[PDB]
Structure formats: structure tokens, C-alpha cells
């Protein structure tokens, strides 16, 4: 905080975009990355204070499940200080 | 304001094309993105006025269900100001 | 003469086989070829409505015999936009 | 004329390469195209006289079934005159 | 210069696993591979013991978060790899 | 030295492990890597037929251990019409 990251992965782009907007609506988080690794998987990564990050991912997960298919939801309170040099989480 | 988002996701290009065609016919909307993320999924994104986008999306979902499988249907009336930095939702 | 007919398969060979069967069966023109991943290939032909229908019927038949047919559709009057994405 | 087309589609690159090798060994055919449209699918396209193309595809099909999994086998005796404009079959 | 490898399906499990690996020991993320079908691979390098400790933590985290596909350690990667690998 | 060794696995890790085992097993050269979807990764090696056989067998076993082996194959004497559309050299 404010370096905590929230992670949402859906099966479908529309569920992911819906979740993304729901996440930034619900808390003061910043979208820092989007990953599409195939087989329908789309991942949206947000950063901010750990409290806001959890609020974001909770709202994002609910929206993803309603719009399409939620695959994963996760929070990393303190990412490794050098993680952001290999994965976009800043 | 003319930044409402309409979202359709189907299985396969043909159902998505049919859907996209139905959306632009239905109302004053603009296709702003097309995404292909695997497992047969194809997504069509449109923008325009809220009413136009709602109408286009309804037409999109109906056509999608006829040609193939409709996976997702969604509307975002008032997108977060940061959404477009990172998703293509603008004309 | 601006109607389009669409054949989508899960595999290149079934798509190519369908494409040839279509132009053989009617005086249509292959105008586009789309591959959206995971084996999906779409062939788009253009012509008069009656013949794109005959073409897609022949294409669908051949696609099913050769491989896996995913979709078959005809749009008599497609829009004049769609755009750079479609 | 030597413009008949022989088509083999496999799942897995190894089955396709093995099949491709069997196809040119089996007859007087020439590898014209190679396609990989996702989901493991690999296509091999050969050209030549109809009889040779027939012999090539049967050998390719057998090898593909041995090494991996055969998806499609097809022969087009006389391809449409403008087929080779949207599809590499020369 | 041993390497440790973690592969998952889904980016989320992979990012969590990578984070665990660099936290666990003296390793450095030197590569990342996404070969399709949702598969995501992360590779770290360093001394053997550290690489081993990282992958254990990496595999543990990956299984908790999502689905772990493969976990492996190569104490000394061959030089004849660095052209297509 | 024209023989081809072919290994196909699920996932990058099983493939890299297999590739590593192959180049350590004999005097072969990795000439290609192919990722054609559904999790499939292929590694192709070339060299003398004996070396290719030893490499291929050692790669396949490592592949079974790390992940799943899909295909294993050896082409002792590949046709010359193959190299024009397939990286085997
Ligand atoms: Cl909204
Ligand atoms: Cl043969
Ligand atoms: Na319109």
C-alpha cells in the first residue's frame, strides 16, 4: 500500500472489461496491466492500497461471474520490490 | 457525452460478424474494438449514446443467439475515466 | 450482388475444401479469410443472394465431410460500415 | 496438368512433419503450403498430378495416425481457377 | 546458474507463483513464456539450492491460487539451448 | 548427419526439460521449436541417426517425468523437399 495488487482472471473478454470498469468504480485502484494468455483467459491487474485493492477485486469478481465466467481472483498485499521489473504491476 | 459501451461476445467469427452487423444497423453506434481471446470466443465492442448502445446491444444479442452461441452481453453507460487507457472503448 | 455468405470451420483443410466447393457451386467471389485462433477459419464469399445461399449450402456440406463445421450464415445486405475491425 | 491438391491436417506439429515427409516420399508431389491455425492444428498442402496426390495423402494420413492424431485428409482434383488467390495452392 | 521453472494455466496463478519464487530465495526472473492454451511459464536463475527453494514456494503458491501445470529444476542448463530456448 | 529427432509435449517446461536432456544425450543440434496450440510445444533436433535416436529417447523420458508426452518420432533420412517449408537444419 499503495503497492498492493489485485488480480482478476475471466474466461471471456467481455467479462473482463466489465470487471475492470467495476473495479475502478468501486475503489481507488489503478489498472496497471491486462494479459490474454489464451484459451479464453483474460487477466486484469490493479494496484493501490490493500484495503482498496480487496474492495476492487470483490466487486470485480461479482461482476465477472454475472457477465460471464470468473476463473481466478487474488490479492498480493506486498509484492516483491523487484517483481515490477518483470511483470507490469506499477 | 457519447461514451456508452456495448459489449457482445460469441463463439466464432461468423456469429460475431453477424452480431456486429446487426449492432451498427440498429442504432448510431461505432465499433471500437474486436477481441479474440481463445476457446472460440469473439467479442464486439461498440460506443455511442446510451439509448443507441442499449438498442445496438439488444440487436447484437438477438442475432448472436440465432447464428451461434451468445456468451456475454453487457452495457456500460458511463465508463470510468481511466478505462480507455488499457482497453479500446473510444472511436 | 453484394450479399455475403460465411463458412466457419475448426481447421484449415475443411475451410479450404469448403471454399473451393463454394466457388464451384455458384458464381460467387471469395472476398475474405478470417482466422480467430483455436483452429477457427472463416471463409467469406460475395455475390447475388440466391447464389451465395447455394454456395454456402455446398460449402457447409463439404466442410462437415472433411472436418468440423462451426458456423454457416448468409447476410443478404450487410451494412456499409462494420469498419477496420470487420 | 499437375495442379491437383492434397491436404493433410493434424494435431501436433510432430505428426504433421512426419506426415509431410511421408507425403513427398510416397509420390511425385511438391509441398506448396503449410498452415497452423491454432488449437494444435497443423496443415500440410501438396500439389501434383491427381494420382500422385492421392498416393501422397494416403501415406500422409497413415503416418499422421501413427505419430499423432489425424484431423482431415482431402484431395481436390481440379481446384477453382481463382482459388489460389486467397489460398496458397500453386 | 541453475534454472527453476513453474508453469500454470492462467496468468494469475503464474504472477502469484513468480512473486513467491523471488521472495523465497536469491533468484532472478530471467525469462517468461506464454505458449498458448492459458499456459504461463516463469523461469528464475541462481545457485541450485536457491532455485530449488524458490520453485517449491512457487509450486505451493500456484496450487493454492490456481492450477499448477509443471514444476522443474535444471541444475546446469546446456549451452546448446540458447538459440530457441 | 541428416536424421531428425521429434519431441512434442504439453507446456513449455516439459519441452525445455526435454530439449535440455536431448542436447546433453548426444551430438545433436536444436533446429526448431514449434508451438501450435492446445498446450503443444515441439522440439526438433538434427544430427547422425544414432545420436538422434539417443537424444530422442532421453528427451521423451524426461518429458514423461516433467509433464505429458504427446509425440515421439525419428526420421532417419528426411526428404530434401522437406527443408523448404520445415526448419530441419
Ligand atoms: Cl456505467
Ligand atoms: Cl511414403
Ligand atoms: Na447505425
Domain borders along chain B are 1-91
Resolution of this deposited model, Å: 2.2
- Lookup: cell for F2: 541428416
Helix (H) or strand (E) holding A38: strand A30-38
Give the method used: X-ray
Inter-chain residue contact C41 with D37, CB threshold 8 Å: yes
DSSP secondary structure string for all residues of B25-88: HHSSEEEEEEEEEETTEEEEEEEE-HHHHHHHHHHHHHHHHHHS-EEEEEEESS--TTGGGTS-
Calpha distance A68→A62 (Å, rounded): 10
Q: Which residues on chain A are in Cβ contact (under 8 Å) with B5?
A: 17
Angle between helices A13-26 and A50-67 (to 10 degrees): 140
DSSP secondary structure string for all residues of E50-61: HHHHHHHHHHHH
Q: Which of C15, C42, C45 shows the shortest CA–CA distance to C27?
A: C45
Calpha distance B46→B27 (Å, rounded): 11
Classify domain D1-90 at the CATH topology level: Alpha-Beta Plaits (3.30.70)
Judged on CB neighbours under 10 Å (0-12, 13-18, 19+), A57 is: buried
- CATH architecture assigned to B1-91: 2-Layer Sandwich (3.30)
In chain F, DSSP finds a helix count (H) and a strand count (E) of: 2, 4
Q: How far is the CA of D59 from the centre of ligand 2 (A)?
A: 5
Residue D73 near residue D61, CB atoms below 8 Å: yes
Residue C63 near residue C75, CB atoms below 8 Å: no
Going across the sheet that includes B70-76, the strands are: B29-38, B41-48, B4-11, B70-76
What is the CATH class of C1-86? alpha beta
Inter-chain residue contact B14 with C37, CB threshold 8 Å: no
DSSP secondary structure string for all residues of chain D: ---EEEEEEEESHHHHHHHHHHHHHHSS-EEEEEEEEETTEEEEEEEE-HHHHHHHHHHHHHHHHHHSEEEEEEEESS--TTGGGTS---
CA angle B12, B13, B19 (to 5 degrees): 100
Q: Which of C61, C50, C48, C49 shows the shortest CA–CA distance to C20?
A: C61
Assigned CATH for E1-85: 3.30.70.1710
What is the least distance, in Å, from the CA of B21 to any CA of chain A?
18
User: Which of the ligands is closest to the CA of residue A21?
Assistant: 1
Neighbours of C71 (CB within 10 A): 24
Classify domain F1-89 at the CATH topology level: Alpha-Beta Plaits (3.30.70)
Tell me phi and psi for residue E67, to 5 degrees: -110, 130
Rg of chain E taking only CA atoms, in angstroms = 12
Residue C40 near residue C12, CB atoms below 8 Å: no
Nearest residue of chain B to residue A35 (CA atoms)? B37
How many Cα neighbours within 13 Å face the side chain of C7?
A: 35
Amino acid at each position: 500500500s499503495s503497492n498492493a495488487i489485485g488480480l482478476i482472471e475471466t474466461k471471456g473478454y467481455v467479462a473482463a472489461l466489465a470487471a475492470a470498469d467495476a473495479m475502478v468504480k468501486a475503489a481507488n485502484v489503478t489498472i496497471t496491466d491486462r494479459q490474454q494468455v489464451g484459451d479464453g483467459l483474460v487477466a486484469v491487474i490493479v494496484t493501490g492500497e490493500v484495503g482498496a485493492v480487496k474492495a476492487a477485486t470483490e466487486a470485480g469478481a461479482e461482476t465477472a461471474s454475472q457477465v460471464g465466467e470468473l476463473v481466478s481472483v487474488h490479492v498480493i498485499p506486498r509484492p516483491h520490490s523487484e517483481l515490477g521489473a518483470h511483470f507490469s504491476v506499477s
